[PDB]
Amino acid sequence: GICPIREELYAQTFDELIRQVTINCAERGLLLLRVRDEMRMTIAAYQTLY
Amino acid sequence: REVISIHIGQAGIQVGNACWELYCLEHGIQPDGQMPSDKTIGGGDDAFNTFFSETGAGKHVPRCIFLDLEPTVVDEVRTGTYRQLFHPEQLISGKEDAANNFARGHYTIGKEIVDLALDRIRKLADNCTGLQGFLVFNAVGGGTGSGLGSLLLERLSVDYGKKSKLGFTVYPSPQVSTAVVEPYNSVLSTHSLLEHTDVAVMLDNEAIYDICRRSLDIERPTYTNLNRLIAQVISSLTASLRFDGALNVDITEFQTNLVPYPRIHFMLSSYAPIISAEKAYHEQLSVAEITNAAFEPASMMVKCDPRHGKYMACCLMYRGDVVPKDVNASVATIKTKRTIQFVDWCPTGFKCGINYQPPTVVPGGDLAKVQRAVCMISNSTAIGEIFSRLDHKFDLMYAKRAFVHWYVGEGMEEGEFSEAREDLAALEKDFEEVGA
Amino acid sequence: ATRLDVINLQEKLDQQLQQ
Amino acid sequence: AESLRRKQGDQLWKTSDQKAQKEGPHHTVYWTTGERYQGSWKDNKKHGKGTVIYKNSDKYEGDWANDMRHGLGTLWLYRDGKYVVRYNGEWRADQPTGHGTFFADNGDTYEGEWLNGRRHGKGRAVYGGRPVDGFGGDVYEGYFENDVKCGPGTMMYANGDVYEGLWAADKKNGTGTYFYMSKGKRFDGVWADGAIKCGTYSEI
Amino acid sequence: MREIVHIQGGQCGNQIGAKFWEVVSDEHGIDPTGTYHGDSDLQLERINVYFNEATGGRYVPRAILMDLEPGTMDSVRSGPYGQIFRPDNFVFGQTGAGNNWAKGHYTEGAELIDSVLDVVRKEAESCDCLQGFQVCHSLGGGTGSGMGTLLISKIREEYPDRMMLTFSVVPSPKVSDTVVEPYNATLSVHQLVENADECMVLDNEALYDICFRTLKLTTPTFGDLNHLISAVMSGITCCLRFPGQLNADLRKLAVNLIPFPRLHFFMVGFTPLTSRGSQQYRALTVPELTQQMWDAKNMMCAADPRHGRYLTASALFRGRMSTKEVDEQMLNVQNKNSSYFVEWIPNNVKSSVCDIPPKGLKMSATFIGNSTAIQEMFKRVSEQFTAMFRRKAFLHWYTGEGMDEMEFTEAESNMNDLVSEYQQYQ
Ligand SMILES: Nc1nc2c(ncn2[C@@H]2O[C@H](COP(=O)(O)OP(=O)(O)OP(=O)(O)O)[C@@H](O)[C@H]2O)c(=O)[nH]1
Ligand SMILES: Nc1nc2c(ncn2[C@@H]2O[C@H](COP(=O)(O)OP(=O)(O)O)[C@@H](O)[C@H]2O)c(=O)[nH]1
Ligand SMILES: [Mg+2]
């Protein structure tokens, strides 16, 4: 099941991973952040529908 | 460690007819599938493993698939001086011609002959014990070489996949040309060749004419003259498996030390010394000047100046009795040479393979018996210019929809025309981004 | 992976989405 | 068979020529200094959604229709012509012919309705920079009918003063009204072929 | 193994074919009686393309002969190499042509072509792999222009894939040997453009000029003109019958020479053409052959190619040859005059080689050019047609045999649009 603390922790891990990949090369981080925001808006729409 | 050969198109089968003669001469096999009774052997009972196979009693048969649609050159071979040597079934001749049409070569007629050649390929592979790779020999400027060749490449990649492929393909020259509709076939076959053939080696008709004009001293050369030194180049490439090499390179060294990126596999070729009898014994053949002539831009089978680009990497196969000190000093001299420049990200980029077999001589030929020879295969970045010039030729033809109806009358649409165009564009971009 | 690869990924995704 | 024994002689090359129509969403089409066009293709020329680039280093994406019409279009020379967007809006009969935004180099930014040039249509055209702020040199709203706007319009000068009336970029002897809103006075009359010939000046 | 079938119609077609089979039979080495008495064994290998062994070596050529009067079959059988033609291949009528396209293509067509399709289909089944059809006929006559054209329609309706070479002679102002040439030329070209694949257009003034200038002959005649046409027709199929350094099949010729499906009216020429007086002075070398080819005085059609633009061209060569010299010549000639070739095609000229030159020589060639200066050929006939038809001249011979003036107007329109297309591509 879904849990807000699980979501927050996974978001923190995603931030750390995107920080690492940006330190490698920034453009990959830009793409990853855009993808993150897009499924964030998708899940927001799903939550509104529910 | 056998290597199989596929010759597609009239050009491919002619090169094979002029190259298997070199192999059967190198391994002392009589031109009817046997050895002479008397001991006239250079040494060894398996120097011919990579190309032939004894069957009960000294009856060797080459590992060759001579596939062509229109049967005028296949039966020319069938009635030529090699009848008791070739396998009667390997020589696959179809029914009608491809007629410079990739459509007819790849969809209409190809589909009913690829599955007929594939079974012979499978039988040869199953007979083989340590199969090493494929060597394809074809012409992109025609129908069978481009169309049927690309179809066979795709349908061998789908099946075997992991095995290496070395594609010796000819391109049209920037100015000298025979076929009118060759740009279409060239681009269509280039798209297929890009992501299937492991290592692409390039040849050019005018780029061999001018060498035969400036070096071999022939003002009226011909195909029967070009094919002989093409056979020489492939023999220099394959001699490592055959003969005992002190510093020898198997077929996978080419892909391991000369393909830094999988997209980038397009290679200039050179061969020294291109000398005849008149000046052969007057000049002195030494590892310094033969190598220098190899790296000069006037002795390349691909008409392209390496000055406009940067040598990414290089391989040098040496035949004959050569001591490694001189080749090491020679590559040092090359690294100190000014004109040719390297991309700075490759500090070591010279593979130096060496064998213990001197180059062979064919009776009635032009090249003479020599001590040592060198074959230089260079992954440079000047080949993007070749592709771009061919593309600029293609654009004018495609703008006016000329000759397009002949193509589209078969299964070919315009979508693959456009996708081959954009594939060549992507290749251009990749080569230029490699850049500095 | 290359910078050309990532920028071409951007281009390809944008082209596919412009429908 | 019956497939062969059919009226196919002429028809074979006729259908081949038809199949050579050069249409469909091709991956790309190129020339030398030509119109690099990517998008859906039909009727032998640019028809459908697609982007076109050419000699003027201007890469504009719009809905092509055989060049006898065109859909929504976005024309711009971005970071090479050094301007974000030059035109943005729908097209009709190879002309915007409706809601359109245009951005000159620095002259102005015109967002309005207009058909076959700015010869008719009601809209706005801020003839000054800094359009996000009141520092804009002026803001005009009304009927464009030429460079001389030639209609009933109204514009604010950014000092608070407003003009409301008939306009031929000026000097149309049309009864208008002008508001010294800062002072608190207003002048109604006739801008007869000039800034002033007659009228009445009053106290709001 | 790639079969070719030859179709002869009209008096001119019958004579030209009776000379073409003459040349082919003598070069493959079959004597007049019908047996095989050649010398070399390389000719025996491809005789199937043109011949069938019946029983006991009596080779029968694979040809169809058609006409409307027996007065041409009599001459065909009488002439040398007459006995070779299979007696089943003499479909002839009884009435006669009459020079009316109506009798050629509508009335007598029904009762003759239905009878000759049996022979052509039987021949097609008798051979195994048809490469295509070669038909030698006329455009200025009644049988070749009309009945030959209707047979072209029927054959293309039957086999769509096979190519067609149409060796057609056309009328001319200076050598106008009859008075209704425009009608039977337009009413034939209208179907020829739609229906054929390679239109080998010839004439008589060009052949007479060749036999007068290049051959220096004193009294040239139909024998000599037909001999030249036969030489060209053998050179065009040299590749299928003999191997060489670079083979060239009929579909390859069509692909390399046609940029648009209805732009397929070529113009042909032979090389070398030297006089018997000065046989032993010229040099049979590739530069001389190419110089003799690329000029107006050798083309076998009333076209001034320098008054136009060679869209494409093809050059067959025969003899032990160097493709290096061949293609350097074909490139130097191309780069000397970039104006006379089209702008948007690189390498306008295709080349091909074979290793056996024709008997009696050692080095030959054959030039086939797709030019845009061939439009004026049809322009002459079009203006003649306009002038004659504006006053309904001779029209009753047509409009009294099930024909309508709408046919004439549409044929004129088709010629006009074709010549417009040539003119546009310049
Ligand atoms: N160097 C060299 N090139 C050849 C030889 N034969 C053909 N070519 C090249 O092949 C190109 C055209 O392709 P084709 O020879 O027709 O081969 P293909 O793919 O089988 O085409 P089709 O015979 O019509 O099926 C020409 O431009 C020549 O450059 C040859 O013997 N030596
Ligand atoms: N070049 C050439 N032309 C010919 C020869 N025989 C006839 N012609 C011309 O070609 C045309 C052929 O049409 P025609 O003989 O009337 O056909 P038919 O009478 O219906 O069989 C004639 O008008 C002649 O002028 C020949 O041997 N050589
Ligand atoms: Mg071929």
mmCIF file of N, CA and C in Angstrom, chain D residues 36-121:
data_model
loop_
_atom_site.group_PDB
_atom_site.id
_atom_site.type_symbol
_atom_site.label_atom_id
_atom_site.label_comp_id
_atom_site.label_asym_id
_atom_site.label_seq_id
_atom_site.Cartn_x
_atom_site.Cartn_y
_atom_site.Cartn_z
ATOM 1 N N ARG D 36 14.226 22.116 -45.601
ATOM 2 C CA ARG D 36 14.268 20.935 -44.743
ATOM 3 C C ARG D 36 12.917 20.844 -44.051
ATOM 4 N N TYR D 37 12.082 19.901 -44.469
ATOM 5 C CA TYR D 37 10.739 19.782 -43.924
ATOM 6 C C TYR D 37 10.559 18.408 -43.299
ATOM 7 N N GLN D 38 10.083 18.392 -42.059
ATOM 8 C CA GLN D 38 9.791 17.162 -41.335
ATOM 9 C C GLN D 38 8.335 17.202 -40.902
ATOM 10 N N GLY D 39 7.561 16.214 -41.320
ATOM 11 C CA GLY D 39 6.163 16.145 -40.955
ATOM 12 C C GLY D 39 5.363 15.411 -42.013
ATOM 13 N N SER D 40 4.051 15.367 -41.784
ATOM 14 C CA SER D 40 3.149 14.649 -42.675
ATOM 15 C C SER D 40 3.109 15.305 -44.049
ATOM 16 N N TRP D 41 3.075 14.476 -45.088
ATOM 17 C CA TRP D 41 3.177 14.932 -46.467
ATOM 18 C C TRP D 41 2.082 14.272 -47.290
ATOM 19 N N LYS D 42 1.396 15.063 -48.111
ATOM 20 C CA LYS D 42 0.395 14.530 -49.026
ATOM 21 C C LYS D 42 0.150 15.550 -50.128
ATOM 22 N N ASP D 43 -0.460 15.076 -51.215
ATOM 23 C CA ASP D 43 -0.761 15.903 -52.385
ATOM 24 C C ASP D 43 0.506 16.504 -52.992
ATOM 25 N N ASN D 44 1.605 15.754 -52.924
ATOM 26 C CA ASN D 44 2.875 16.028 -53.594
ATOM 27 C C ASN D 44 3.606 17.249 -53.047
ATOM 28 N N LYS D 45 3.027 17.989 -52.105
ATOM 29 C CA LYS D 45 3.683 19.161 -51.543
ATOM 30 C C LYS D 45 3.375 19.195 -50.050
ATOM 31 N N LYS D 46 3.982 20.146 -49.345
ATOM 32 C CA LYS D 46 3.836 20.228 -47.897
ATOM 33 C C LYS D 46 2.367 20.344 -47.512
ATOM 34 N N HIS D 47 1.847 19.317 -46.842
ATOM 35 C CA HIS D 47 0.464 19.330 -46.373
ATOM 36 C C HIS D 47 0.405 18.594 -45.043
ATOM 37 N N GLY D 48 0.070 19.313 -43.981
ATOM 38 C CA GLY D 48 -0.065 18.742 -42.657
ATOM 39 C C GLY D 48 0.906 19.363 -41.673
ATOM 40 N N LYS D 49 0.831 18.870 -40.440
ATOM 41 C CA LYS D 49 1.736 19.328 -39.395
ATOM 42 C C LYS D 49 3.176 19.056 -39.796
ATOM 43 N N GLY D 50 4.049 20.022 -39.554
ATOM 44 C CA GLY D 50 5.452 19.817 -39.848
ATOM 45 C C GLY D 50 6.241 21.094 -39.669
ATOM 46 N N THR D 51 7.545 20.913 -39.507
ATOM 47 C CA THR D 51 8.487 22.013 -39.372
ATOM 48 C C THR D 51 9.302 22.151 -40.649
ATOM 49 N N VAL D 52 9.575 23.393 -41.037
ATOM 50 C CA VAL D 52 10.345 23.695 -42.234
ATOM 51 C C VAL D 52 11.445 24.686 -41.883
ATOM 52 N N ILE D 53 12.639 24.412 -42.392
ATOM 53 C CA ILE D 53 13.824 25.229 -42.179
ATOM 54 C C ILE D 53 14.411 25.519 -43.549
ATOM 55 N N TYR D 54 15.027 26.682 -43.709
ATOM 56 C CA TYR D 54 15.535 26.986 -45.041
ATOM 57 C C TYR D 54 16.647 28.028 -44.949
ATOM 58 N N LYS D 55 16.972 28.631 -46.096
ATOM 59 C CA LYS D 55 18.178 29.435 -46.242
ATOM 60 C C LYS D 55 18.232 30.596 -45.258
ATOM 61 N N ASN D 56 17.081 31.142 -44.872
ATOM 62 C CA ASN D 56 17.044 32.293 -43.980
ATOM 63 C C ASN D 56 17.231 31.914 -42.519
ATOM 64 N N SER D 57 17.703 30.695 -42.252
ATOM 65 C CA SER D 57 18.008 30.234 -40.898
ATOM 66 C C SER D 57 16.812 30.414 -39.967
ATOM 67 N N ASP D 58 15.617 30.182 -40.503
ATOM 68 C CA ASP D 58 14.373 30.335 -39.762
ATOM 69 C C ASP D 58 13.614 29.016 -39.781
ATOM 70 N N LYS D 59 13.516 28.390 -38.617
ATOM 71 C CA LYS D 59 12.992 27.039 -38.446
ATOM 72 C C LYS D 59 11.584 27.141 -37.871
ATOM 73 N N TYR D 60 10.575 27.173 -38.739
ATOM 74 C CA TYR D 60 9.215 27.406 -38.275
ATOM 75 C C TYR D 60 8.341 26.177 -38.485
ATOM 76 N N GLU D 61 7.564 25.843 -37.459
ATOM 77 C CA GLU D 61 6.713 24.661 -37.435
ATOM 78 C C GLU D 61 5.255 25.088 -37.500
ATOM 79 N N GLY D 62 4.531 24.571 -38.490
ATOM 80 C CA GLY D 62 3.131 24.893 -38.652
ATOM 81 C C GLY D 62 2.388 23.757 -39.320
ATOM 82 N N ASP D 63 1.089 23.961 -39.514
ATOM 83 C CA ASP D 63 0.245 22.974 -40.183
ATOM 84 C C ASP D 63 0.162 23.343 -41.658
ATOM 85 N N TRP D 64 0.910 22.622 -42.488
ATOM 86 C CA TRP D 64 0.933 22.894 -43.918
ATOM 87 C C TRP D 64 -0.342 22.402 -44.589
ATOM 88 N N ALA D 65 -0.797 23.143 -45.600
ATOM 89 C CA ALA D 65 -1.860 22.665 -46.487
ATOM 90 C C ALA D 65 -1.506 23.079 -47.915
ATOM 91 N N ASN D 66 -0.699 22.250 -48.581
ATOM 92 C CA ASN D 66 -0.428 22.365 -50.012
ATOM 93 C C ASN D 66 0.099 23.737 -50.424
ATOM 94 N N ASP D 67 0.421 24.583 -49.443
ATOM 95 C CA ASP D 67 0.826 25.972 -49.645
ATOM 96 C C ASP D 67 -0.268 26.818 -50.291
ATOM 97 N N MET D 68 -1.460 26.252 -50.472
ATOM 98 C CA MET D 68 -2.650 27.049 -50.738
ATOM 99 C C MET D 68 -3.408 27.388 -49.464
ATOM 100 N N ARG D 69 -2.929 26.912 -48.321
ATOM 101 C CA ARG D 69 -3.446 27.265 -47.005
ATOM 102 C C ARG D 69 -2.437 26.752 -45.986
ATOM 103 N N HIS D 70 -2.670 27.086 -44.722
ATOM 104 C CA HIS D 70 -1.755 26.698 -43.661
ATOM 105 C C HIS D 70 -2.486 26.858 -42.338
ATOM 106 N N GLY D 71 -2.214 25.963 -41.395
ATOM 107 C CA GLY D 71 -2.907 26.012 -40.122
ATOM 108 C C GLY D 71 -2.255 26.943 -39.123
ATOM 109 N N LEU D 72 -2.228 26.534 -37.859
ATOM 110 C CA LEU D 72 -1.495 27.279 -36.848
ATOM 111 C C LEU D 72 -0.008 27.257 -37.174
ATOM 112 N N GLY D 73 0.629 28.421 -37.104
ATOM 113 C CA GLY D 73 2.029 28.540 -37.437
ATOM 114 C C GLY D 73 2.832 29.281 -36.389
ATOM 115 N N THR D 74 4.065 28.826 -36.186
ATOM 116 C CA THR D 74 4.992 29.413 -35.227
ATOM 117 C C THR D 74 6.289 29.714 -35.962
ATOM 118 N N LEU D 75 6.485 30.972 -36.343
ATOM 119 C CA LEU D 75 7.616 31.381 -37.162
ATOM 120 C C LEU D 75 8.588 32.169 -36.300
ATOM 121 N N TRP D 76 9.865 31.797 -36.351
ATOM 122 C CA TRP D 76 10.823 32.340 -35.400
ATOM 123 C C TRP D 76 12.244 31.968 -35.790
ATOM 124 N N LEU D 77 13.182 32.846 -35.440
ATOM 125 C CA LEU D 77 14.614 32.655 -35.666
ATOM 126 C C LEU D 77 15.287 32.679 -34.294
ATOM 127 N N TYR D 78 15.292 31.527 -33.634
ATOM 128 C CA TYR D 78 15.581 31.448 -32.208
ATOM 129 C C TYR D 78 17.079 31.283 -31.978
ATOM 130 N N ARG D 79 17.683 32.272 -31.318
ATOM 131 C CA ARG D 79 19.058 32.217 -30.833
ATOM 132 C C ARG D 79 20.074 32.208 -31.967
ATOM 133 N N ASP D 80 19.600 32.141 -33.209
ATOM 134 C CA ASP D 80 20.438 32.343 -34.384
ATOM 135 C C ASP D 80 20.057 33.636 -35.090
ATOM 136 N N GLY D 81 18.789 33.773 -35.472
ATOM 137 C CA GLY D 81 18.241 35.097 -35.677
ATOM 138 C C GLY D 81 18.061 35.872 -34.393
ATOM 139 N N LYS D 82 18.257 35.210 -33.251
ATOM 140 C CA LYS D 82 18.389 35.831 -31.937
ATOM 141 C C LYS D 82 17.078 36.410 -31.424
ATOM 142 N N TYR D 83 15.948 35.940 -31.946
ATOM 143 C CA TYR D 83 14.634 36.393 -31.515
ATOM 144 C C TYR D 83 13.783 35.179 -31.174
ATOM 145 N N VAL D 84 13.048 35.272 -30.064
ATOM 146 C CA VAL D 84 12.334 34.108 -29.543
ATOM 147 C C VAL D 84 11.267 33.653 -30.531
ATOM 148 N N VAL D 85 10.282 34.507 -30.791
ATOM 149 C CA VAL D 85 9.247 34.232 -31.782
ATOM 150 C C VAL D 85 8.989 35.504 -32.571
ATOM 151 N N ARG D 86 8.880 35.372 -33.890
ATOM 152 C CA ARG D 86 8.530 36.512 -34.724
ATOM 153 C C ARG D 86 7.048 36.552 -35.056
ATOM 154 N N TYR D 87 6.445 35.412 -35.386
ATOM 155 C CA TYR D 87 5.000 35.313 -35.517
ATOM 156 C C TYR D 87 4.506 34.054 -34.817
ATOM 157 N N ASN D 88 3.293 34.140 -34.279
ATOM 158 C CA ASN D 88 2.631 33.002 -33.649
ATOM 159 C C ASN D 88 1.133 33.158 -33.843
ATOM 160 N N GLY D 89 0.509 32.215 -34.533
ATOM 161 C CA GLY D 89 -0.930 32.282 -34.697
ATOM 162 C C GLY D 89 -1.393 31.453 -35.868
ATOM 163 N N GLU D 90 -2.712 31.330 -35.980
ATOM 164 C CA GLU D 90 -3.284 30.531 -37.052
ATOM 165 C C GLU D 90 -3.101 31.226 -38.398
ATOM 166 N N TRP D 91 -3.187 30.437 -39.467
ATOM 167 C CA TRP D 91 -3.124 30.941 -40.830
ATOM 168 C C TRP D 91 -4.380 30.543 -41.591
ATOM 169 N N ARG D 92 -4.673 31.306 -42.642
ATOM 170 C CA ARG D 92 -5.764 30.981 -43.551
ATOM 171 C C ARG D 92 -5.478 31.635 -44.892
ATOM 172 N N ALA D 93 -5.502 30.833 -45.956
ATOM 173 C CA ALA D 93 -5.093 31.262 -47.291
ATOM 174 C C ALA D 93 -3.693 31.872 -47.248
ATOM 175 N N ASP D 94 -2.733 31.031 -46.848
ATOM 176 C CA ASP D 94 -1.304 31.357 -46.754
ATOM 177 C C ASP D 94 -1.056 32.695 -46.063
ATOM 178 N N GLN D 95 -2.001 33.124 -45.238
ATOM 179 C CA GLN D 95 -1.908 34.350 -44.468
ATOM 180 C C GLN D 95 -2.447 34.065 -43.078
ATOM 181 N N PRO D 96 -1.856 34.664 -42.042
ATOM 182 C CA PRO D 96 -2.404 34.521 -40.688
ATOM 183 C C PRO D 96 -3.916 34.681 -40.609
ATOM 184 N N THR D 97 -4.438 35.814 -41.080
ATOM 185 C CA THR D 97 -5.874 35.994 -41.310
ATOM 186 C C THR D 97 -6.677 35.732 -40.030
ATOM 187 N N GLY D 98 -6.171 36.221 -38.902
ATOM 188 C CA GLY D 98 -6.865 36.017 -37.644
ATOM 189 C C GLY D 98 -5.974 36.368 -36.470
ATOM 190 N N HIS D 99 -6.287 35.770 -35.321
ATOM 191 C CA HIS D 99 -5.504 35.978 -34.110
ATOM 192 C C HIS D 99 -4.032 35.729 -34.377
ATOM 193 N N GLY D 100 -3.227 36.773 -34.235
ATOM 194 C CA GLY D 100 -1.811 36.650 -34.487
ATOM 195 C C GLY D 100 -0.980 37.529 -33.585
ATOM 196 N N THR D 101 0.164 37.010 -33.156
ATOM 197 C CA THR D 101 1.142 37.764 -32.392
ATOM 198 C C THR D 101 2.387 37.931 -33.247
ATOM 199 N N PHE D 102 2.869 39.159 -33.350
ATOM 200 C CA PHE D 102 4.051 39.487 -34.123
ATOM 201 C C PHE D 102 4.988 40.296 -33.246
ATOM 202 N N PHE D 103 6.285 40.067 -33.404
ATOM 203 C CA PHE D 103 7.296 40.748 -32.602
ATOM 204 C C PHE D 103 8.358 41.311 -33.531
ATOM 205 N N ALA D 104 8.364 42.626 -33.724
ATOM 206 C CA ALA D 104 9.452 43.207 -34.488
ATOM 207 C C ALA D 104 10.747 43.115 -33.687
ATOM 208 N N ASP D 105 11.852 43.489 -34.334
ATOM 209 C CA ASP D 105 13.153 43.429 -33.676
ATOM 210 C C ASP D 105 13.150 44.228 -32.374
ATOM 211 N N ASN D 106 12.865 45.526 -32.459
ATOM 212 C CA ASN D 106 12.589 46.324 -31.276
ATOM 213 C C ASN D 106 11.464 47.326 -31.493
ATOM 214 N N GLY D 107 10.897 47.400 -32.699
ATOM 215 C CA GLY D 107 9.897 48.416 -32.975
ATOM 216 C C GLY D 107 8.648 48.268 -32.129
ATOM 217 N N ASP D 108 8.096 47.057 -32.065
ATOM 218 C CA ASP D 108 6.814 46.870 -31.396
ATOM 219 C C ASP D 108 6.509 45.387 -31.234
ATOM 220 N N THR D 109 5.436 45.121 -30.489
ATOM 221 C CA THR D 109 4.868 43.788 -30.314
ATOM 222 C C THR D 109 3.368 43.906 -30.541
ATOM 223 N N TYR D 110 2.884 43.348 -31.644
ATOM 224 C CA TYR D 110 1.496 43.495 -32.068
ATOM 225 C C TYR D 110 0.745 42.178 -31.916
ATOM 226 N N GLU D 111 -0.244 42.153 -31.031
ATOM 227 C CA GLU D 111 -1.093 40.983 -30.820
ATOM 228 C C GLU D 111 -2.524 41.378 -31.162
ATOM 229 N N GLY D 112 -3.046 40.857 -32.265
ATOM 230 C CA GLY D 112 -4.395 41.237 -32.633
ATOM 231 C C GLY D 112 -4.925 40.452 -33.811
ATOM 232 N N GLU D 113 -6.039 40.942 -34.348
ATOM 233 C CA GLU D 113 -6.707 40.340 -35.492
ATOM 234 C C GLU D 113 -6.352 41.112 -36.753
ATOM 235 N N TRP D 114 -6.059 40.384 -37.828
ATOM 236 C CA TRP D 114 -5.608 41.051 -39.038
ATOM 237 C C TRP D 114 -5.568 40.046 -40.177
ATOM 238 N N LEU D 115 -5.964 40.503 -41.361
ATOM 239 C CA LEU D 115 -6.151 39.644 -42.523
ATOM 240 C C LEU D 115 -5.444 40.284 -43.705
ATOM 241 N N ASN D 116 -4.505 39.556 -44.303
ATOM 242 C CA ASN D 116 -3.719 40.046 -45.432
ATOM 243 C C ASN D 116 -3.008 41.347 -45.062
ATOM 244 N N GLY D 117 -2.087 41.226 -44.113
ATOM 245 C CA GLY D 117 -1.425 42.383 -43.555
ATOM 246 C C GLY D 117 -2.313 43.068 -42.539
ATOM 247 N N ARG D 118 -1.769 44.118 -41.927
ATOM 248 C CA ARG D 118 -2.537 44.912 -40.971
ATOM 249 C C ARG D 118 -3.333 45.968 -41.738
ATOM 250 N N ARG D 119 -4.328 45.482 -42.483
ATOM 251 C CA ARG D 119 -5.246 46.344 -43.211
ATOM 252 C C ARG D 119 -6.636 46.393 -42.598
ATOM 253 N N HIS D 120 -6.964 45.461 -41.711
ATOM 254 C CA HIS D 120 -8.207 45.493 -40.953
ATOM 255 C C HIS D 120 -8.043 44.593 -39.740
ATOM 256 N N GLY D 121 -8.948 44.756 -38.781
ATOM 257 C CA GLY D 121 -8.934 43.926 -37.594
ATOM 258 C C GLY D 121 -8.738 44.703 -36.312
#
